Design an enzyme around this catalytic site. Structure first.
Site, PDB file in Angstrom:
ATOM      1  N   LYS A  60       3.203  31.998  13.610  1.00 45.63           N
ATOM      2  CA  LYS A  60       3.866  32.056  12.318  1.00 45.63           C
ATOM      3  C   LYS A  60       5.177  31.266  12.454  1.00 45.63           C
ATOM      4  O   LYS A  60       5.393  30.262  11.771  1.00 45.63           O
ATOM      5  CB  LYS A  60       4.145  33.520  11.971  1.00 45.63           C
ATOM      6  CG  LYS A  60       4.739  33.741  10.604  1.00 45.63           C
ATOM      7  CD  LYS A  60       3.667  33.754   9.549  1.00 45.63           C
ATOM      8  CE  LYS A  60       3.900  34.885   8.565  1.00 45.63           C
ATOM      9  NZ  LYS A  60       2.804  35.011   7.570  1.00 45.63           N
TER      10      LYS A  60
ATOM     11  N   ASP B   5       4.900  38.578   4.128  1.00 45.16           N
ATOM     12  CA  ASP B   5       4.109  37.432   3.719  1.00 45.16           C
ATOM     13  C   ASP B   5       2.678  37.767   3.338  1.00 45.16           C
ATOM     14  O   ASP B   5       2.063  37.060   2.546  1.00 45.16           O
ATOM     15  CB  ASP B   5       4.069  36.376   4.806  1.00 45.16           C
ATOM     16  CG  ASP B   5       3.604  35.056   4.273  1.00 45.16           C
ATOM     17  OD1 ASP B   5       4.029  34.711   3.160  1.00 45.16           O
ATOM     18  OD2 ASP B   5       2.819  34.358   4.940  1.00 45.16           O
TER      19      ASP B   5
END
Ligand SMILES: NC(=O)c1ccc[n+]([C@@H]2O[C@H](COP(=O)([O-])OP(=O)(O)OC[C@H]3O[C@@H](n4cnc5c(N)ncnc54)[C@H](O)[C@@H]3O)[C@@H](O)[C@H]2O)c1
Ligand SMILES: NC(=O)c1ccc[n+]([C@@H]2O[C@H](COP(=O)([O-])OP(=O)(O)OC[C@H]3O[C@@H](n4cnc5c(N)ncnc54)[C@H](O)[C@@H]3O)[C@@H](O)[C@H]2O)c1
Ligand SMILES: NC(=O)c1ccc[n+]([C@@H]2O[C@H](COP(=O)([O-])OP(=O)(O)OC[C@H]3O[C@@H](n4cnc5c(N)ncnc54)[C@H](O)[C@@H]3O)[C@@H](O)[C@H]2O)c1
Ligand SMILES: NC(=O)c1ccc[n+]([C@@H]2O[C@H](COP(=O)([O-])OP(=O)(O)OC[C@H]3O[C@@H](n4cnc5c(N)ncnc54)[C@H](O)[C@@H]3O)[C@@H](O)[C@H]2O)c1
Ligand SMILES: NC(=O)c1ccc[n+]([C@@H]2O[C@H](COP(=O)([O-])OP(=O)(O)OC[C@H]3O[C@@H](n4cnc5c(N)ncnc54)[C@H](O)[C@@H]3O)[C@@H](O)[C@H]2O)c1
Ligand SMILES: NC(=O)c1ccc[n+]([C@@H]2O[C@H](COP(=O)([O-])OP(=O)(O)OC[C@H]3O[C@@H](n4cnc5c(N)ncnc54)[C@H](O)[C@@H]3O)[C@@H](O)[C@H]2O)c1
Lengths: 551, 551, 551
Positions: B161, B256
């Site tokens: 990420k 997210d």
């Protein structure tokens, strides 16, 4: 120090083997996963991960990655399965890697001295973080196995070799230094490659080349000691013989390709005789090839003979050589060099134009294949030995296997199991029809160089005489048991290259001391105990600090 | 410092890129191959190497090894082929790596907090070698994409990420912190694996679990600040929502999985409206699925609607959901949760038992596939939509490709090229019988979070409201040029996610300041200059000390 | 490294001496005043500063602060004015400093082992930052010169002692280790001082004490080697002798208080014989005192005698001793110890009750003052000797000056310039009524131990026999040139203790090899070249990395 640097250092990083107390006390807690592992568990993990791996090259890349991250685990691993890991980290596969060097490249490994660095070699030497270096392995990459001139990619060799100095002999990793001298490359393939990691120039052969080697020799001893062991590797015949002579009596040097080879070979021939107790005067050896390996072996064989009662001349007369231009004979059109003349004799009445002919004309008792050009020890050559001698000694040393002079099965069957065989490449046990199973031995150089290096280092020896290799050869062969010698094994199982190496080192130190070649002087009474005590162990060291109360 | 330490630090290490000058003046001359290479030649070599690579996991292992040896080069490479590499480093390949973790494991890469270290999380946190952390990505590894609960193997997610935070947004890597909390694992394949690297225990779900997340939340802001960006990932629906609710107003955090999903999705719809301009009130959206992603995109749609003149109740009534138990109806036996309730309307006269029936009974103008259960957008459902709407909006988001509700070709062909299509997984152009090339776009989160994280970081924002995501959605959709929409793209080309991410950054910052959400107050006049001026570059820095005469 | 760390390390720190180049290339530009100075200007500044200094202790504090900031400069200065500085750094001023310790204390300077750390001495020892220690000086601070028992404040002794090992002999400072063992203190002024830096307890004298010295002895050789030079100092008579006896054959050790004393003394006598050539058998030596120093010089005299044709019993009979209780006679009430016994002869017919009477009853030709009790060499005793001997040898060794048995002027004037004089403390020329200038010499140990320590270190000697000291005595006396003896000097000028110390080194090494006491065996042919080639120089080293083009 403490924390991360402790992990970024392979000489200290224990990885998940850091205990909870250590992780906590050293500022690592949280930086590693929640499981604490022992050295045994980590080795078990790698073994599995490597087990399910295909190519030897990927096995190489993975294992060498373990060394750049954890040196202790790396040697534990490689010592736990040394027989199979040795050919990966070194012997055959390392040569595959030296080919992909730059493509497989991930992190530098030794000291690089370029001809462009001439005049400043000590400054480069001073950049080597290790202060107490005891064993240096040098190469100019000019002759890597059968690969030829690989330039700076040859560095993969000293690296792998030093890996074994440590794994088999117990020589300290921190005291080992792999070196590669880059004077250019003659390999056009490399020169064209934009991803080549060396000097984009053709091998410098000028005097600068010689002066650079001198400088490097001087620079190394100046910082590390006059007695620092320097072993040449893959230098290229002419330079390898001349530098060996030029420095042997000036520095603590030796070339494994010439001498280690000579000693592993001799060790085989010695185990053979232990079988066919026949007058050393009843021997005649024929060499398939008259190059580096052939010359080193002949020379050391002759020395074994002389020390037994034969003149130098007599010993050399029983040795013949056949290279790509036929039998090395006095006067032949093909040219003969200095090292060859002693073995260049008067032409027989019948000058052979075939090794098989020579085998028939010369009638040697022993045959040694060091031509590196396929199976030139034809069934005709083979059966022509089993017919000439009751117990033919056949040595096919050319590697890799595809290059050998013949297989073990070929030798054994074609001789009804009456031949004494040994090869440079591995061959499994040959179980013939009558039920007999012959386990052939491989004459690998690793039997010799590690134990010889340690002995020289522990005795602060500053010069290595050829006599040390004869001694080494003798020491190897003495390891063979009765049963081992009874099954065709002219070499002790590679599975114990460790204790064999120590035993060899022990014997060699006893030799250095008795012949006043040793200089570490409060001389040990028990040379065994002495050597055994100075071997580096892969065990992890505890890092905790001694905390105690106070009355 | 200088010397080896300089090379053992990925942040400073420049490999063969160090200049002769730097090598000499820095004590590296001799430790590196005698060749000087540029970051271009370096990138070029590893690129060519990676092209000739078969399996993606290999590709991942390879490239993640570059990041642990030379950070600059790593991001250089990663950015040189962003579209093809993002999926390796993150997006889909990363999940494969997490299953392998323990097998592929080379070196640790983040901060591990275990429920065992409860009460001492600050200590662990203080062990992190970086002092100015601006972006943290946390995961307890309970729900890694489709793989489920992978315990501490989930660390690979925060790591990949973050690689993108840097690769796309230009967020400095030294200010990034990948975190993984180990509170046990429910995965029995793991609990039984002897080489598992986490706690051998079932997931703790008692107060201690909640207490540990609080501790971690406080311990992180204690050391780095209350405005420290902490992003949750792959936590598991119940926790992800509740923890999102619990801290969104206490810390600077977002999820997210929930919020970034709602924004890329919604941004697709906004893109569609550039084609279907009819009033928002005329929209009806049917969801295949009623989980985390359905509730995320839905709620954000509501807000866009509400902000467009619709009451909140009406907005909600324009949305419908069909989980595994059938249409989310008022009173259904199949339990409905607090988050679905607002979308659980009264049963129509004709209650579908199938999504095709549903599509019929409700005739939505927009359909979103988020059930992760293969092709549920049957060729009939597809056509049904093409007959109900001139240009139906079909969004098949379930990943991986095998879980997608339908394909590019499917949707486009069954609609004659009338539908506006978007998917979670990638699909290449869909050329039709008439030669009409239809290039679909992919609704990847990587579109939102990078540019949104950088905006929040640079503005010293302390809390992230859904309005910030609504703004990101509108900021992204504004990136779409006429042409790309003329091609069927409902999103900008992932090829240029960098500028798209920066432009989204500049947009969201402008919004943050304008709405009194920013705290870096000597407020810039040119927010564009402000953002672009603070992005981390992959260019190597000069390490040469300044040498000059004294007049 | 480079930068500040380079300046914070006395070994590397060169202060204003770092060149512009070094500063720039090393990251120091800006951290140092914009001026470049030489070690000459530096020495010159601190010299001038020290000239304008009043009290010696100040001088000591000042100069010891230079040694903790710039080692090279420190030894440069120390060697630039060796005669005047030696007494500040060591000889007498150092004892004053030990009383002050705790008051003057700025930074720690050695290794502290406390009876509290028994069982863990190796841990402490492993904390010493130097790995190749060649010279250790130990003290338990029980008897610092005249000050008595100063507990851990005794550390100042090993520190100053070692400064001279380096200053005079050239023994590398990084291979020196000042040690102080704290087993308690009997000094009540200390036990009550709240700022005392040692253990608040009476001296342990139980087995633990002996056990701790063994532990320390083993712990030191364990880490650095069995040939590691360990010198005892200011231990307290009983222990100094017994521990000397206990380890002299087990380790490489000596006691300068006992052995170095016996050698400078004896070397004075040998010098005298260059004037009084009569047979050794004709010598009679009377000692004022019967302690450590009397027994040291006596026993070494015996050996010189024995080695000159005298039985050991006769040699012994030529020596007499008069302690506080009167002449050491056979049967005296005043107890006599095992070490005095050999010098406790049968009572003469006339037993003196005074040293003047003794001088009369025995008429010795040589008198040695070692009672440390002021002028006991009364003007009458002096004259008595001048009338008994043409050239009487008077040795007033008690220090400091106030404890000396008499003075230069005294002795010379009361003898008309016939006596040969030497003293522990310094005295300037004694010009007489006839204009005859008489420059006496001083019997300082600094004459022996430096050159003897270096010889033992360089030869890898493992044990030091008294014969080694006899050789040092003869080696020193051979330094005396005719002229200096023509001036009354019974020793060479302390001004050139350097070369005198080196020359003594070369002499003792030659003796060590020749007597099979050396172990560094690739034995040098030119022992002179060998010694001189290994002395540590105070010259600053170049820290500039090698920068050059690549042709
Ligand atoms: N321990 C070991 O097993 C060991 C050690 C050293 C060398 N070797 C092997 O020995 C072989 C040769 O090595 P080297 O260093 O001596 O090489 P080299 O190039 O120095 O010499 C090779 C010799 O073989 C001869 N030759 C080549 N082709 C021939 C042919 N077709 N017919 C007859 N003769 C031919 C050449 O004339 C030459 O004299 C290699 O294959 C190598 O693997 C094995
Ligand atoms: N007479 C004795 O037995 C004796 C005498 C003095 C010191 N010591 C001990 O020996 C240690 C210091 O002596 P040393 O370092 O010269 O050792 P050493 O004298 O035992 O070894 C001799 C040489 O072999 C080298 N060596 C030892 N192990 C090596 C290894 N595994 N790999 C590579 N090189 C290796 C050493 O560097 C040295 O040059 C001290 O700890 C001390 O306790 C023993
Ligand atoms: N950016 C993107 O492209 C993106 C982002 C997030 C999620 N997704 C995808 O959305 C899918 C679901 O994600 P989630 O986190 O919401 O999952 P989830 O487990 O929280 O919810 C899945 C929902 O689908 C329903 N469902 C399952 N099978 C069904 C079936 N056969 N028929 C009808 N309904 C069914 C379930 O009832 C459940 O409500 C995943 O496959 C994921 O790949 C894509
Ligand atoms: N008014 C101005 O323009 C102004 C004022 C003062 C200082 N400065 C300059 O700013 C520098 C230091 O200030 P700062 O670090 O607080 O910057 P900043 O105030 O411009 O940045 C704001 C916040 O964003 C973070 N940040 C910036 N770039 C980042 C990146 N690429 N990745 C991750 N986080 C990032 C910073 O840590 C900071 O917390 C100084 O070198 C100084 O020259 C500019
Ligand atoms: N190199 C040198 O110049 C040198 C070296 C060592 C010792 N010394 C000096 O020698 C003196 C004694 O040293 P030590 O360690 O042998 O001391 P010590 O305490 O061991 O012995 C002193 C002896 O002097 C005797 N004594 C004391 N007062 C006396 C008196 N008033 N009359 C007669 N005898 C008396 C004592 O009985 C004792 O036997 C010290 O002052 C010291 O400075 C000089
Ligand atoms: N035959 C020779 O002349 C010969 C042989 C080998 C190595 N060397 C050189 O010697 C160097 C390293 O060998 P070494 O350190 O064992 O030297 P060394 O063997 O010459 O010295 C003998 C011993 O004295 C010690 N020593 C030397 N100078 C000292 C000093 N000034 N202060 C305190 N202790 C001192 C050493 O530590 C060593 O234990 C290398 O740089 C190498 O170039 C010379």
């Amino acid at each position: 120090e403490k924390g991360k640097p402790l992990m970024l250092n392979p000489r200290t990083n224990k990885g998940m083997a850091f205990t909870l107390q250590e992780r906590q006390m050293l500022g690592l807690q949280g930086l590693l996963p929640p499981k604490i592992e022992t050295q045994d568990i980590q080795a078990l993990r790698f073994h599995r991960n490597l087990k399910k791996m295909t190519s030897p090259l990927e096995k190489y890349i993975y294992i060498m990655g373990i060394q750049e991250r954890n040196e202790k685990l790396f040697y534990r691993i490689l010592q736990d399965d040394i027989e199979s890991l040795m050919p990966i980290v070194y012997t055959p596969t390392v040569g595959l890697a030296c080919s992909q060097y730059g493509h497989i490249f991930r992190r530098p490994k030794g000291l690089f001295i370029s001809i462009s660095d001439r005049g400043h070699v000590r400054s480069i030497v001073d950049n080597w973080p290790e202060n107490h270096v005891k064993a240096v392995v040098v190469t100019d990459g000019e002759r890597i196995l059968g690969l030829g001139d690989l330039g700076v990619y040859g560095m993969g060799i000293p690296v792998g070799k030093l890996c074994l100095y440590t794994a088999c002999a117990g020589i300290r990793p921190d005291r080992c230094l792999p070196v590669c001298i880059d004077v250019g490359t003659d390999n056009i393939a490399l020169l064209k490659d934009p991803f080549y990691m060396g000097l984009y120039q053709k091998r410098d052969r000028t005097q600068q080349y010689d002066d650079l080697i001198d400088e490097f020799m001087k620079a190394i001893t100046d910082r590390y000691g006059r007695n620092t062991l320097i072993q040449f590797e893959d230098f290229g015949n002419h330079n390898a013989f001349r530098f060996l002579r030029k420095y042997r009596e000036k520095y603590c040097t030796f070339n494994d390709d010439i001498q280690g080879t000579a000693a592993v070979a001799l060790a085989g021939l010695l185990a053979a005789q232990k079988v066919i107790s026949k007058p050393i005067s009843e021997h005649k050896i024929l060499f398939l090839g008259a190059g580096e390996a052939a010359l080193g072996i002949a020379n050391l064989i002759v020395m074994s003979m002389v020390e037994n009662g034969l003149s130098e001349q007599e010993a050399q007369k029983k040795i013949w050589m056949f290279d790509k231009y036929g039998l090395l004979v006095k006067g032949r059109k093909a040219k003969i060099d200095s090292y060859q003349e002693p073995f260049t004799h008067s032409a027989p009445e019948s000058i052979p134009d075939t090794f098989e002919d020579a085998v028939n004309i010369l009638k040697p008792s022993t045959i040694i294949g060091v031509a590196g050009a396929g199976r030139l020890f034809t069934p005709d050559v083979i059966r022509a030995m089993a017919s000439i001698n009751e117990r033919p000694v056949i040595f096919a040393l050319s590697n890799p296997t595809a290059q050998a002079e013949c297989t073990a099965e070929e030798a054994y069957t074609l001789t009804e199991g009456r031949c004494l065989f040994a090869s440079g490449s591995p061959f499994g046990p040959v179980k013939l029809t009558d039920g007999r199973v012959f386990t052939p031995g491989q004459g690998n150089n690793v039997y010799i160089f590690p134990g010889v290096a340690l002995a020289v280092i522990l005795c602060n020896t500053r010069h290595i005489s050829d006599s040390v290799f004869l001694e080494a050869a003798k020491a190897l062969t003495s390891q063979l048991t009765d049963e081992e010698l009874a099954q065709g094994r002219l070499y002790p199982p590679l599975a114990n290259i460790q204790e064999v190496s120590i035993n060899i080192a022990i014997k060699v130190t006893e030799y250095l001391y008795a012949n006043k070649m040793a200089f570490r002087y409060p001389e040990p009474e028990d040379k065994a105990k002495y050597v055994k005590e100075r071997t580096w162990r892969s065990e992890y060291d505890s890092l905790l600090p001694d905390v105690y109360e106070w009355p």
